[PDB]
Amino acid sequence: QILPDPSKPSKRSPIEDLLFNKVTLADAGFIKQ
């Protein structure tokens, strides 16, 4: 649950995937604006 998940594209853990889904990012527009 805490080690990186290789199946997914970004090598995040299941808990880190949940964390990134659960926080709704707002000012992250960098490359295309």
Binding site: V23, T24, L25, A26, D27
Partner: protein, 49 residues
């Protein structure tokens, strides 16, 4: 995240506040008035912003 977003929104919405001047949009201040008397309004907008 929210605190910064609302600080930015306060900053943006404060652009459209005349700060006592005859209007907030600079173009109207410039066209309506001559340069000397519109200078006062522009300076007030500048100090407020």
């Amino acid at each position: 995240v929210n605190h910064n977003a609302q600080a930015l929104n306060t900053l943006v919405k404060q652009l459209s506040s005349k700060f006592g001047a005859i209007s907030s949009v600079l173009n109207d201040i410039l066209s309506r008035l001559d340069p000397p008397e519109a200078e006062v309004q522009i300076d007030r907008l500048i100090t407020g912003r």
